[PDB]
């Protein structure tokens, strides 16, 4: 008789409304982990973050964007305002581990560079300070119609992923704290991405 050979494997396009990934924020403690579902309908956002369907997936150049609730028992995104630059967001899929790091917040010029140099490559730091990512704030408040926040190159008119892009991860939630009038946006940039098969999970998980 014969047997299936099992391996870390996943569908190319996540099944609608199903969990296809898991995210961790070590700065928020080891217990902080949420499944990510495909889709951003009310039903999808019920048990945790949902992936915006037309955006990139984890580890991809472009923008991997998710929405999540802010209020409620076990809302995933109530404390995004407490993230600091270089804080890790770890994303697991069935085949891979990705580490994103929160981009510099509100700073510009020399201070932005120095902050970026804390966890990004010197090349990424330059792009963040003076290059294609100069305009991209790690956290800000915006209006519900701000659709370019989830564009492949955030807050631009570039929608198609391109090989020259960094990997971005975007988290969106309501704002202010007990309201849905506005939206909070957080951007983090990809610093690690590698396949499973082996016990090697990112060192970033041990932080905080
Ligand atoms: Cl409020």
Structural class: mainly beta
Counted by DSSP, the helix tally is 2
What fraction strand?
Answer: 25-35%
Helix amount: under 10%
| Attached small molecules | chloride ion
| Strand arrangement, major sheet | 1-2-3-4-8-9-6-5
User: Termini, distance in Å?
Assistant: 49 Å
One letter per element, helices H and strands E, the order comes to EEEEEEHHEEE
What is the count of structural domains? 1
Specify the oligomeric state. monomer
PDB class: hydrolase
Keywords: sortase, structural genomics, IDP58950, Center for Structural Genomics of Infectious Diseases, csgid, hydrolase
Assembly: monomeric
Entry title: SrtF sortase from Corynebacterium diphtheriae
Description:
The protein has helices at 109-116, 122-130, and strands at 19-24, 33-38, 50-51, 62-67, 88-93, 96-102, 139-142, 167-175, 182-195. With 208 residues, the chain is mostly beta strands. It has one domain. A hairpin with a 6-residue loop joins strand 8 (167-175) and strand 9. Helix 1 (109-116) runs antiparallel to helix 2. The longest helix has 9 residues, at 122-130. The chain starts with 18 loop residues before the first strand and ends in a 13-residue tail after the last strand. GO terms for molecular function: hydrolase activity. It comes from Corynebacterium diphtheriae (strain ATCC 700971 / NCTC 13129 / Biotype gravis).
